[PDB]
């Protein structure tokens with residue numbers, strides 16, 4: 001059973017679905033879309049229950065900031081959004097809680113989805129990791145990215161490290177993370193962190209244009225291609241060729 | 256026995272050899288160098304029979320288009336260039352036929368060759384994959400690249416997925432393939448898809464300049480270095496260092 | 511026991527330590543910081559004996575050239591800096607000698623260090639490999655990089671091949687190495703070979719600014735993050751997520 005709109009609103013999220021496209025909006029603009037444990041676990045539940053027809057997922061924020069990262073209340077011992085924090089616990093179980101949070105991000109790599117992050121203003125820490133977890137990022141010219149965790153004495157543990165390294169290379173990833181510095185939209189484009197940067201007023205139109213292009217390609221070939229691309233880096237060439245060819249047999253049969 | 260010029264012309268290809276350099280030209284300009292099964296299998300035969308002296312291979316097209324991709328006659332049941340199509344068959348064997356086509360591209364990664372694609376106008380689908388299979392691409396400013404297969408309900412299965420991911424990263428590869436969109440020469444340079452972009456009238460000169468630079472480096476060291484570079488991504492650092500050192504023992508002995 | 515300043519000066523090196531930062535300066539400006547076997551083995555000894563407090567290492571050259579690569583005396587049979595050359599030997603043991611040289615570069619990848627190369631003028635061959643071995647490169651606008659080894663009939667065997675491929679991709683790495691061509695600072699920035707390029711007179715200030723940013727992030731989180739980033743490329747995503755989470759348990763405990 002998918003989370004209800006009421007349940008999602010209590011977790012700071014909106015979800016709407018129109019045919020093949022789902023839009024998830026981070027919806028705590030008064031806290032600049034700061035993230036909580038409940039928000040991460042509801043994201044996971046959305047992923048697990050999306051209709052089979054959905055093949056594009058767009059993640060956006062309400063207001064001028066994509067996400068200010070982890071809600072600073074998560075660093076206290078009291079419950080947040082009804083749920084215990086890592087600090088509640090510390091005052092195996094912790095490992096299980098973190099794993100449950102990571103499930104909110106992992107599903108954005110599913111082969112049967114194209115995930116798109118549409119980022120304006122800051123994407124800090126967990127928020128930067130959410131954007132990194134998506135297949136594609138479209139940034140407003142107001143976007144500012146930062147991996148703040150190390151500044152706080154923490155590591156990035158919401159699945160961001162792999163896509164960051166893939167995008168910018170290990171050397172630049174070291175520089176960004178170990179300085180915890182802020183990257184503006186122009187630098188983000190230059191470093192491959194954004195696939196497109198547009199004026200702030202055009203971000204919705206640019207997302208819509210991309211969605212239209214994706215929907216114009218048939219769903220089964222889109223999914224099979226994504227699945228191939230995700231394997232390509234780790235396979236040797238001979239193996240990748242065999243996987244490509246195996247995928248085509250199934251496409252040619254359908255056609 | 257190498258394919259004869261007559262046999263190659265029947266398959267839409269020219270091959271000339273001058274000392275250490277082989278030039279392969281796609282030669283069906285009236286069909287914008289559309290590719291067939293026979294063309295792919297002759298490419299493989301060229302690779303398998305090149306003289307040992309050849310260490311540079313340049314791939315070009317006749318006319319304004321590098322290649323319009325697969326010949327649309329390949330989507331019919333009739334034979335093409337004397338050979339059955341995948342659709343002839345569908346109306347294991349198919350898997351073997353596709354594997355035989357892939358051999359036309361795989362050999363361009365051989366350590367004892369530097370392969371160069373010199374691209375003007377469109378390189379679509381199989382043609383984009385041919386260019387991707389080469390070590391180096393030099394583009395005219397008129398070049399336009401596109402991975403059309405998914406738009407047609409197919410996957411890229413001519414060995415293009417791995418080099419595309421290596422060049423642009425998995426995230427951008429998803430965006431390019433799942434939108435099937437056209438990339439102009441300036442964007443291609445920006446995304447690392449071209450090592451150099453030059454004015455159309457200068458493409459032959461730029462290729463010649465590169466060939467001259469490659470020939471100025473001794474053949475045995477060029478081959479040994481290429482072989483090291485191809486392993487570097489998949490090895491851990493300790494292993495890569497051991498492989499480097501093993502390669503140098505053999506070079507130092509010769510010197 | 512760390513090498514003494516006197517011993518290091520005999521090997522063409524200076525080392526100074528100020529709290530958490532070590533500065534290693536190549537110090538044979540009359541030979542444009544050409545490198546010898548003794549210099550490589552002293553670099554290794556510095557790495558092995560650095561105080562535990564050191565977490566940033568900056569590598570610079572004296573004078574206008576970062577390093578002219580291997581000292582051409584290393585291609586003779588006589589001893590250099592008191593030590594036998596590969597050619598002394600040739601006129602398993604050689605394999606052990608090369609491995610001992612590689613130890614001078616390998617340690618720059620240690621998770622408990624951030625290594626920074628500050629490059630002006632030429633970095634040729636072994637010198638290019640030294641810069642590549644560091645986590646971060648800051649280039650003067652006067653910097654010129656080149657992988658000369660293949661021009662000399664050799665391969666790069668001082669651990670440079672892996673970081674070069676990571677930075678520029680295998681295709682561009684082939685082009686650079688097999689032409690042995692010179693890359694200026696603007697192209698180096700464009701190819702990700704430099705994280706920042708600054709005017710020559712500002713290189714020391716830019717290095718100091720970076721050091722300040724690194725020192726502002728706590729040491730334990732910096733080390734744990736570097737260690738995660740170094741694994742990210744080779745792990746699958748599920749594994750990388752498990753490693754991230756394991757690293758965070760230890761950070762959260764400390765906090």
Ligand SMILES: CC(=O)CC(=O)SCCNC(=O)CCNC(=O)[C@H](O)C(C)(C)COP(=O)(O)OP(=O)(O)OC[C@H]1O[C@@H](n2cnc3c(N)ncnc32)[C@H](O)[C@@H]1OP(=O)(O)O
Nearest residue numbers: 030031032034068069070071072122124125126148149154
């Ligand atoms: C392990 C991990 O995953 C760790 C992480 O994510 S670490 C990231 C933790 N996040 C941060 O440190 C970011 C904290 N916030 C900020 O830097 C800034 O608010 C900002 C740059 C996002 C925007 O700054 P600004 O534009 O000047 O707006 P600002 O006034 O600060 O914020 C608006 C409101 O959002 C709230 N807010 C912003 N970030 C918040 C957060 N992370 N948690 C709770 N509230 C937050 C502020 O309290 C403020 O509330 P009031 O209006 O009630 O005062």
Ligand SMILES: CC(=O)CC(=O)SCCNC(=O)CCNC(=O)[C@H](O)C(C)(C)COP(=O)(O)OP(=O)(O)OC[C@H]1O[C@@H](n2cnc3c(N)ncnc32)[C@H](O)[C@@H]1OP(=O)(O)O
Nearest residue numbers: 285286287289323324325326327377379380381403404409
């Ligand atoms: C699994 C895979 O590997 C799949 C793939 O490759 S999918 C790719 C299949 N290819 C395509 O869809 C490209 C089809 N062609 C084109 O888009 C266009 O011809 C082009 C963009 C290449 C050039 O367009 P243009 O400059 O306006 O020239 P245009 O008039 O179209 O083409 C010139 C001639 O080439 C022919 N031609 C172009 N592409 C051809 C193709 N792929 N197969 C057969 N003929 C082709 C046209 O029939 C035309 O013939 P006439 O002169 O006799 O009419």
Ligand SMILES: CC(=O)CC(=O)SCCNC(=O)CCNC(=O)[C@H](O)C(C)(C)COP(=O)(O)OP(=O)(O)OC[C@H]1O[C@@H](n2cnc3c(N)ncnc32)[C@H](O)[C@@H]1OP(=O)(O)O
Nearest residue numbers: 540541542544578579580581582632634635636658659664
């Ligand atoms: C396996 C490996 O790891 C292999 C490698 O590294 S291969 C790299 C070997 N290195 C080279 O071929 C570079 C050789 N040197 C050069 O190209 C040039 O000196 C340079 C481009 C670095 C600078 O050129 P420049 O600015 O015109 O200065 P230049 O006059 O040449 O050099 C200054 C001095 O440094 C010396 N020098 C430069 N490189 C040297 C080297 N590698 N070995 C010994 N001396 C060197 C020159 O002999 C010269 O000495 P004098 O002043 O006594 O004449």
